[PDB]
Scaffold this active site. Structure first.
Site, mmCIF file in Angstrom:
data_model
loop_
_atom_site.group_PDB
_atom_site.id
_atom_site.type_symbol
_atom_site.label_atom_id
_atom_site.label_comp_id
_atom_site.label_asym_id
_atom_site.label_seq_id
_atom_site.Cartn_x
_atom_site.Cartn_y
_atom_site.Cartn_z
ATOM 1 N N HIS A 55 50.653 -36.975 -6.616
ATOM 2 C CA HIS A 55 49.938 -38.121 -7.574
ATOM 3 C C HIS A 55 51.520 -39.310 -7.992
ATOM 4 C CE1 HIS A 55 49.287 -39.591 -11.585
ATOM 5 N NE2 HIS A 55 50.543 -38.688 -12.549
ATOM 6 N N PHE A 56 51.134 -40.295 -8.319
ATOM 7 C CA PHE A 56 51.577 -41.156 -8.596
ATOM 8 C C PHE A 56 51.665 -40.654 -10.200
ATOM 9 C CE2 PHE A 56 54.036 -45.247 -9.565
ATOM 10 C CZ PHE A 56 54.347 -46.024 -8.602
ATOM 11 N N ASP A 57 53.143 -40.863 -10.683
ATOM 12 C CA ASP A 57 53.136 -40.488 -12.361
ATOM 13 C C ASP A 57 53.561 -42.147 -13.079
ATOM 14 O OD1 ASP A 57 52.323 -38.972 -14.018
ATOM 15 O OD2 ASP A 57 54.380 -39.045 -14.470
ATOM 16 N N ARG A 83 46.574 -54.608 -11.205
ATOM 17 C CA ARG A 83 45.639 -54.160 -12.386
ATOM 18 C C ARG A 83 44.940 -54.865 -12.220
ATOM 19 N NH1 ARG A 83 48.882 -56.743 -17.394
ATOM 20 N NH2 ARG A 83 46.857 -55.805 -19.475
ATOM 21 N N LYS A 122 45.276 -37.822 -0.266
ATOM 22 C CA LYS A 122 44.851 -39.087 -0.906
ATOM 23 C C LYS A 122 45.818 -39.828 -1.615
ATOM 24 C CE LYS A 122 41.997 -38.998 -5.184
ATOM 25 N NZ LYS A 122 41.987 -38.064 -6.320
ATOM 26 N N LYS A 135 39.064 -49.106 -9.833
ATOM 27 C CA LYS A 135 40.409 -47.861 -10.789
ATOM 28 C C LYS A 135 41.230 -49.075 -11.161
ATOM 29 C CE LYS A 135 43.969 -45.177 -9.679
ATOM 30 N NZ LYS A 135 43.776 -43.220 -9.604
ATOM 31 N N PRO A 136 41.312 -48.324 -12.273
ATOM 32 C CA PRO A 136 42.215 -49.708 -13.317
ATOM 33 C C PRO A 136 43.409 -49.816 -13.349
ATOM 34 C CG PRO A 136 40.954 -48.350 -14.704
ATOM 35 C CD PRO A 136 40.536 -47.244 -13.340
ATOM 36 N N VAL A 137 44.509 -49.480 -12.658
ATOM 37 C CA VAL A 137 45.847 -49.183 -12.045
ATOM 38 C C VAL A 137 46.219 -48.531 -10.709
ATOM 39 C CG1 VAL A 137 46.327 -50.657 -14.113
ATOM 40 C CG2 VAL A 137 46.917 -48.140 -13.787
ATOM 41 N N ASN A 138 46.754 -49.512 -9.502
ATOM 42 C CA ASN A 138 46.700 -48.529 -8.666
ATOM 43 C C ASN A 138 48.388 -49.182 -7.653
ATOM 44 O OD1 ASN A 138 46.588 -46.231 -7.043
ATOM 45 N ND2 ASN A 138 46.707 -48.167 -5.522
ATOM 46 N N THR A 139 49.506 -48.386 -7.573
ATOM 47 C CA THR A 139 50.564 -48.548 -6.625
ATOM 48 C C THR A 139 50.714 -48.283 -5.535
ATOM 49 O OG1 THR A 139 51.679 -48.308 -9.193
ATOM 50 C CG2 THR A 139 53.044 -48.690 -7.087
ATOM 51 N N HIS A 165 48.452 -44.245 -2.119
ATOM 52 C CA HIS A 165 49.843 -45.328 -2.696
ATOM 53 C C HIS A 165 50.877 -44.981 -1.455
ATOM 54 C CE1 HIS A 165 48.389 -43.948 -7.026
ATOM 55 N NE2 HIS A 165 48.664 -42.794 -6.018
ATOM 56 N N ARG A 191 46.084 -42.351 0.765
ATOM 57 C CA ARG A 191 45.844 -43.269 1.393
ATOM 58 C C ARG A 191 45.900 -44.465 -0.327
ATOM 59 N NH1 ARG A 191 40.808 -42.969 -1.990
ATOM 60 N NH2 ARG A 191 40.813 -41.215 -2.433
HETATM 61 O O1 LIG Z 1 51.938 -47.116 -12.269
HETATM 62 C C1 LIG Z 1 51.017 -46.536 -12.237
HETATM 63 C C2 LIG Z 1 50.234 -45.851 -13.250
HETATM 64 C C3 LIG Z 1 49.667 -45.174 -12.765
HETATM 65 N N1 LIG Z 1 48.828 -45.225 -11.383
HETATM 66 C C4 LIG Z 1 48.022 -44.473 -11.097
HETATM 67 C C5 LIG Z 1 47.928 -42.842 -11.029
HETATM 68 C C6 LIG Z 1 46.230 -42.203 -10.927
HETATM 69 O O2 LIG Z 1 46.119 -42.163 -9.740
HETATM 70 P P1 LIG Z 1 46.343 -40.742 -8.886
HETATM 71 O O3 LIG Z 1 46.613 -39.082 -9.666
HETATM 72 O O4 LIG Z 1 46.054 -40.353 -7.966
HETATM 73 O O5 LIG Z 1 47.500 -40.916 -8.534
HETATM 74 C C7 LIG Z 1 45.590 -42.530 -12.304
HETATM 75 C C8 LIG Z 1 45.577 -42.108 -13.340
HETATM 76 O O6 LIG Z 1 46.851 -42.440 -13.676
HETATM 77 O O7 LIG Z 1 46.443 -44.380 -11.464
HETATM 78 C C9 LIG Z 1 49.692 -46.019 -10.035
HETATM 79 O O8 LIG Z 1 49.082 -45.897 -8.854
HETATM 80 N N2 LIG Z 1 50.777 -46.316 -10.801
#
Ligand SMILES: O=c1ccn([C@H]2C[C@H](OP(=O)(O)O)[C@@H](CO)O2)c(=O)[nH]1
Length: 124
Positions: free
Chosen positions: A119-121, A85, A7, A41-45, A12, A10
């Site tokens: 997870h991307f923190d 974003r 995941k 999804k609000p934000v994703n990197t 990040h 897929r």
């Molecule tokens: O700079 C940022 C901050 C947050 N997220 C993400 C992390 C989480 O997705 P995730 O555990 O699957 O990786 C989600 C809830 O914060 O959005 C990013 O991709 N980039």
């Protein structure tokens, strides 16, 4: 079904593009990677480095996770990333995003055996 490790890849990983490029990148990628399936999804990197380089972060600088856990790590070198974003006029299922490229240190949470990102923190 889908493992946390898979995941993460897929959601990040995007090594094909050195900087993602294209103002449409996020609109296309958030959809292609199924990040707009259930909701926008609000934000994703997306990280533009080799999988090996990103996985290697799990053995780098140990830092506290935003949730308080201790299994987060910060990359010693900066990495090419793209933050997606959601816009204000964005309405599901027609999710719209702003594509912003940057070069920063990434922070990910790792677990398992092999010890890999799940997870991307954050990025700093
Ligand atoms: O700079 C940022 C901050 C947050 N997220 C993400 C992390 C989480 O997705 P995730 O555990 O699957 O990786 C989600 C809830 O914060 O959005 C990013 O991709 N980039």
């Amino acid at each position: 079904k889908e493992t946390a490790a898979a995941k993460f890849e897929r959601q990040h990983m995007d090594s094909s593009t050195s900087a993602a490029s294209s103002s449409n990148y996020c609109n296309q990628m958030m959809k292609s990677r199924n990040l707009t399936k259930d909701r926008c999804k609000p934000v994703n990197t997306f990280v533009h480095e080799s999988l090996a380089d990103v996985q290697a972060v799990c053995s780098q600088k140990n830092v506290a996770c935003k949730n308080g856990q201790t299994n987060c790590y910060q990359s010693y070198s900066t990495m090419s990333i793209t933050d997606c974003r959601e816009t204000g006029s964005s309405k599901y299922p027609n999710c719209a995003y702003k594509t912003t490229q940057a070069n920063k240190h990434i922070i990910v949470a790792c677990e398992g055996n092999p010890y890999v990102p799940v997870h991307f923190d954050a990025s700093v």
